[PDB]
Amino acid sequence: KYFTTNKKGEIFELKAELNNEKKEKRKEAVKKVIAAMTVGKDVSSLFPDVVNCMQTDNLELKKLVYLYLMNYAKSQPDMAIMAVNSFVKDCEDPNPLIRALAVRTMGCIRVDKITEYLCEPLRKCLKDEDPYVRKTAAVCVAKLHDIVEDQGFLDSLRDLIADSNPMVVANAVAALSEISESHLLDLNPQNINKLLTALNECTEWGQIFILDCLSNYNPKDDREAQSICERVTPRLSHANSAVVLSAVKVLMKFLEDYYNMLLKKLAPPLVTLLSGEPEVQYVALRNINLIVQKRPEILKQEIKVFFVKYNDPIYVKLEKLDIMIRLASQANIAQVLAELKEYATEVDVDFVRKAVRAIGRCAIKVEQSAERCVSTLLDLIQTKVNYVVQEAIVVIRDIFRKYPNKYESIIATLCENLDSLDEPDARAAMIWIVGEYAERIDNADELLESFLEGFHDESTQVQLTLLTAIVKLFLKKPSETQELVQQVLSLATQDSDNPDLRDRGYIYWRLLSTDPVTAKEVVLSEKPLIDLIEPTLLDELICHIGSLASVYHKPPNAF
Amino acid sequence: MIRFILIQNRAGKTRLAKWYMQFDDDEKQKLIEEVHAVVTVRDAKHTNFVEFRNFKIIYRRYAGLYFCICVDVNDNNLAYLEAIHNFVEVLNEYFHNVCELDLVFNFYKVYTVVDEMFLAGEIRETSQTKVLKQLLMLQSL
Amino acid sequence: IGGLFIYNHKGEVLISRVYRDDIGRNAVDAFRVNVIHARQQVRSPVTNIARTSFFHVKRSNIWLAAVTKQNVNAAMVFEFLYKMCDVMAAYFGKISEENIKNNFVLIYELLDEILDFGYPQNSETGALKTFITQQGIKSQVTGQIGWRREGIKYRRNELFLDVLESVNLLMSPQGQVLSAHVSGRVVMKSYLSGMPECKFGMNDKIVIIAIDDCTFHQCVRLSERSISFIPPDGEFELMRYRTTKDIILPFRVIPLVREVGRTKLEVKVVIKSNFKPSLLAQKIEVRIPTPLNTSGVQVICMKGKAKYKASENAIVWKIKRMAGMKESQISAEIELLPKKWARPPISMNFEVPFAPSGLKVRYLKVFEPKLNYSDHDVIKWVRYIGRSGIYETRC
Amino acid sequence: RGLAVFISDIRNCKSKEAEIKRINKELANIRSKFLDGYSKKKYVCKLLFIFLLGHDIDFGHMEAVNLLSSNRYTEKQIGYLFISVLVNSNSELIRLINNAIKNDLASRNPTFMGLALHCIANVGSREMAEAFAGEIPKILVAGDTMDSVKQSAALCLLRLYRTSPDLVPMGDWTSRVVHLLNDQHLGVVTAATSLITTLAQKNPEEFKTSVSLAVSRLSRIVTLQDYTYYFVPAPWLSVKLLRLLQCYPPPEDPAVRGRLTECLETILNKAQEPPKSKKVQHSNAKNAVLFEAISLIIHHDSEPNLLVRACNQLGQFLQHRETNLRYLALESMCTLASSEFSHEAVKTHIETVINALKTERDVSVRQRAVDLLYAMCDRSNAQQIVAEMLSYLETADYSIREEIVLKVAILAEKYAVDYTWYVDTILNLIRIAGDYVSEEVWYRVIQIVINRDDVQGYAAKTVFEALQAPACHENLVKVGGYILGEFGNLIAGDPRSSPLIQFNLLHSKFHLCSVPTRALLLSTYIKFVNLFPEVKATIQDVLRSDSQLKNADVELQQRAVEYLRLSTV
Amino acid sequence: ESVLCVKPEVHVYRIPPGYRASEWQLDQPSWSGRLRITAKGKVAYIKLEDRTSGELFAQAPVDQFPGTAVESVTDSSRYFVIRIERAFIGLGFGDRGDAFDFNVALQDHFKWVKQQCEFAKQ
């Protein structure tokens, strides 16, 4: 009410030379209107004065008006409809850059009334003789569809597939594919042959669009599906990674001696995606993580490509590490453990903790290398690093559960590492190893007494494992540890206020006071010994190799 | 007490900044950019009272500009909202339906108005009649 | 592709263009809250929040976001976002907000001719000269090392890093963070034979009344987000920084203080450790101020211990350890001797084993040109020591 | 006219680097000129405008001080404006500036003294306090001083007291400052009240005679054509007079105290009246006096009749149109409810606050609504407040949800009437928002169920329907298993709550929950073996399944294997 | 063959003559182009390509990294003496971080070659 004048000011001074007669400094004016409203200045009062500059013959000045109009076409569409009479005069002008830019500007306006204006002037643009205009009109059908005469436009998209300029063919296929999400049949004789010949000549973004459409096609005969694949095979040599991953998605679908030759031609293009820029390697390695599950015989020999390089980002280091495990076999476990030992000495504390856990995943997967993984972790603990030692205790615990009564010489070396333990899960791993095997540990009660003095202010995982261990120590060594169990069950049932802790204290208190012989088969019995997408979801995500369903490893229903 | 007075548009660039507190030149730039990080976010139904780093900021927008006064936490925030509006009305008759560009071209006259009305972190003169009596007398001197 | 967003260094929208109205104006700030200002979230080039996917590529400052709602080819959008910025770099030189602000008109002419309803068109810079009318607005020998002596040898090469930083905070009793900044330094201890040249790498939480500031040691040469240097032998301050954005706050004090008349006072204070439970804060001391006319108080504590100190006029409450994602409470009952009480802030001391600015070390590659050792022969240690400075909550 | 050319020459730059070259070609031009005084002040306005854009200026100070010694007004006020903005610490310049100010202060031109008094009050360094702080009270005292100079001198002495209190000692001039409250020019009184207020913060008893002068002037102001501001008689002076009275206790003279009552009664009585204008600037100026009136009544805490009328006036602002009055009424009632006198009258507004909490959108006003509910809680209304907060938490946003859960659990234990209500309260709290409930809150709920027998049929019942929801919190599952495992027999008589249904209700949530949550549900599965022998076949296959025996956790395995051997042996 | 490292903006200095760096010209780069260290088998090839077409300006088989094929200059950490195949050629780099990746990728190759020899000695 105070700083709105319309007699003087910046809006007044802008409105002045926009009304002037020189063309070249009305062009400077509209640039000042775009640069005002980009930063966030309110130039809504200049709207009927900018569209007076539409009636001209200059191409540069007419685009600057259209750029001003496009910024209104999405946020406040009810204002940009007020100049729609100037659009429909421009969409039959010569200099067909004006005709295409008129049709784009009309299509981007979300107003129900504009469908009366994307009538009959649109169908001339679908039949235009400049292919740059047919390219524009092909997309604007999908703009109009996203808002029965347009059902007559749908067959005009099919007519544009038979064109000599292939970029017109490209956007028409991309238009039909988005329309077919909410409704195209690609029957062989003329559709597939004209798509694959346009595939060899169109631009790099249209080859994505054609190879995304062929994945919807269902072939019938086995050598008919083979006859497609000799044309798709040279498309996995392209510079773009989006073209290669779309070519793979067709070839992973149309996979019914040429079978053996095709799987040998999938491995060099998937290797060469990893020389790319780090966002692309993430998109590739999330798909490589799916391909080595469904077809593990493609990249069986290529584990050296997947070794983590130091300057990779953290989202490429963690995805390269999941594929090194899936290719970890007995023929190459020795160089994997050369790498996993090396990554565990890096300064990235987030990545070292996963490299040490990847060692125990190689011991569980490759059973023949269990001793080499145990000797690898022992060399890590001798470094005395705080975040490696207490990580490797967790991993050794899962080996003792997996391979019991084999590796228990090393506990005399693990038990001297107690003062380097401050994680709750890492302390609970040593208490389990002291709780088990206590007829092998010399001073198991002197170790477990050192934890009961600080029984509170420990985690309930540590409190429960220390409860389970001292009961196991009692049934293994009665009459030495009578003081510990009367200590810890007084700590559990009387001092602690956790209900889950104090009744587990009771269940042990009831069993020891009923029959310690009966408690031996209950507590100290032998425990039964103890990571891949299930093939319903897995075979779904191979049908979406390029897309975000494979980057997320989730079906498209959750998007 | 008042600690500064800001005038800045939605573009972010200031039209007046008078400081009543001893800050460094880069600290003055640091506060300015994080005032309109507060003021531009708030809508027309939020309150005009934002706590700001240990004191409070008081604003009102005049359709292209923000007048921000930054006072202590104890201060009467409903009286400093009207001393803002009292300061605009003095600028309204002194510049004859003031625009934004009167603050750009005549910044040295704006410091005369602020000294006339807000001196040493307090409100000096509230009367619109006596300020316009004083400012036009200095205009012809 | 629903809309290309180009954000500045600080997280503000420089220039943007939406192509699909499935994208709202909620999505321009959905990226700001949950990608740029992610406090503890580990970075990913594609993230998904609330049925909307976020593609971003950084070019040295600038967040180039790409927003979509469909199951689009993700390798398509990233290969687009490289050729979206190679078109711009061929017109601007580099990509920065000083070049983008000079070129709001050229980007708008590009963001229509390159991308059309989310469908990438021909991005060839030779073909664009027929379509783009506007023009871009353009804008030896180190001899001897002075700081490191020659012929150093050690029995075993080792290397120690300490990221040492201190949190400062003023927070309202409602939970609004009023002011926060972290002051830190990377102290490196180099026990390395020979004269190694080594490369250091970190994440992007450092900008290379507190103001965001970073100085280096004179050994460091800056020219990616990597740093090459030749470390002096021994104790050595590698980097020295302050930061103010996206501060990780380890604790929260919730001061529920009720005045009963003018003769009695009860104070409830709740501590919530706001970090992951595998970590463990230590040396925790919450001093709670009392009025000047306090007779004697009655304090009960859940864990830890507290004692009233009339010489300080404050209740000092000390906890030995606190695991993350937990909660403690103290209660107090003050009797007074009958103006109003001006409230000092509840100050707090602690020490956490993580770096509260978000700084992390990604790699540290040590290379000696003329000896028989390399990086995997070098034992490296990393330790994060978070600490409080002025960490206070209004009562 | 040369300035407006240069500014629009900067504004017509199309890049940042075009500015730097245009600035530097002008900085090189101005440096070459360093003249007519008109041509000298034009360049300083150029140099000042370059500074305010943020560019570094490292000259021009000696040219600006040469403007201070001029005799035309515009050359002086541009010279002082350069000095006030660009503060240099050259010891030669500070000597030259102080001599230029002593020339203007010794002058009897009121406009030349007005520039000098502002330049001291804008820079305010110690070197200007060391030369001037003995002259400024002499100008304020003297009877020949113009009233507009009396305004600027009083506020200039205010900053010299704020910057360096030791260089402004009190004395003879203090008894004549308080006489300015009797002055006819209200602008002089306005600059006087700000001066007396800050000086009475540390030496209150010296300025004690201003208490009687403040009330008598305020009684005339409340009960001036140039000082009305939208039909309100002198709002900012009446705000400053009410802040002056807050530096003191209620006065010694009961004739002063009685006069202080009806002026505060008049302010309250005007608030009840219909407004004399529709514009919001009338009501903001009208209420600016009112909230400082209420802050004075709270400060004294001496007339309970005024406190009751003040609380009744603040209840009118809770259901008000604008957000600015709803927020300030909630801050005031939090400070008002703590008093001995108004605390019973705030409690009558319990219906008004909750109806404001449910409908307010603004998150700042919404959380001061919660603080008022916590502040006015008592034994008499705790069941009402807690039940209304729980009715808010079912539809609340996640922004305010954390602090309300903390306040429900604090009011529940503190004001627990019996032990049947508290158990019903927190179990209702864990069902609604269980992820914000601390475990020592959750631990004590079970200790009351175990210790006392009467609630056990009621607690084990209410947990069972709480578990029938598809979206239970994981703390609800943990309190769900332990109570049904201990007291499922107390509700086994219901065919809707049959023992096989209680097991299937828990085991439907045994997955999709955490690792210590699964370990607690195993503990009650064996309690269903002990209590419910007809369920025993349906539990043991769950225990002997591979998902519990070959479970990757140690503690989930050790607890599942022991319970399979308790059930068979 | 695999490609170990690709570096643009790499200078080639003809050497006028030990091995100090200020002795060379350091202002007249005798050749400029793109650097690629390729390797196949047990050796590594330092191939110099022009920026535009990619023709092989020079090539140096290495076969041991601290050996005689690549020798560091004593003044700086950027300049290298290359035995192309014969003759000796002086390289150049822009900063340390380009010379860092030159030196690490060579050593990371011959670390792998030492391990594959050691696996054959098992």
Residue numbers in the entry:
A (entry chain B): 5 to 151, 156 to 191, 196 to 268, 275 to 548, 553 to 581
B (entry chain S): 1 to 141
C (entry chain M): 2 to 140, 154 to 222, 241 to 255, 260 to 374, 379 to 435
D (entry chain A): 11 to 44, 50 to 238, 244 to 589
E (entry chain N): 7 to 23, 29 to 96, 102 to 138
Sentences from the paper on this structure:
Clathrin-Mediated Endocytosis (CME) enables cells to dynamically regulate the composition of the plasma membrane and mediate uptake of transmembrane cargo, such as ligand-bound receptors. This process is orchestrated by the clathrin Adaptor Protein two complex (AP2), which interacts with much of the endocytic machinery and functions during the earliest stages of CME. NECAP is a coat-associated protein that binds to the alpha appendage and beta linker regions of AP2 to facilitate endocytic accessory protein recruitment to sites of endocytosis. NECAP is a ~ 29 kDa, soluble protein composed of three domains: an N-terminal Pleckstrin Homology with ear-like function (NECAPPHear), a central Extended region of conservation (NECAPEx), and a C-terminal domain with low conservation (NECAPTail). Here, we determined cryo-EM structures of NECAP-AP2 complexes which show that NECAP clamps AP2 complexes into the closed, inactive conformation.
To understand whether NECAP binds to the site of phosphorylation or a conformation induced by phosphorylation, we determined a ~ 3.2 Å cryo-EM structure of the phosphorylated AP2 core bound to full-length NECAP2 (mouse). We observe density for the entire AP2 core, with additional density contacting the mu subunit. The remaining unassigned density at this interface extends from the amino terminus of residue 159 of mu, and can be attributed to the phosphorylated mu linker (amino acids 154–158). Our structure is of sufficient quality to build a near-complete molecular model for the phosphoAP2-NECAP complex, which shows that residues in NECAPPHear interact directly with the phosphorylated mu T156 (pT156). These data show that the phosphorylated complex can exist in a closed conformation and suggest that the mechanism of NECAP binding to open complexes that are not phosphorylated must be fundamentally different. We also noticed that NECAP R112 forms electrostatic interactions with the T156 phosphorylation mark and may be required for binding. Indeed, NECAP R89 lies only 5 Å from mu pT156, suggesting that it may also contribute to coordination of the phosphorylation mark. Additionally, NECAPPHear does not block cargo- or PIP2-binding sites and no obvious steric clashes would prevent AP2 from transitioning between open and closed states when bound to NECAPPHear. One feature that might prevent NECAPPHear binding to the open conformation is that mu T156 is packed against the beta subunit of AP2 in this structure. Nonetheless, while NECAPPHear is required to inactivate AP2, binding of NECAPPHear alone does not explain inactivation.
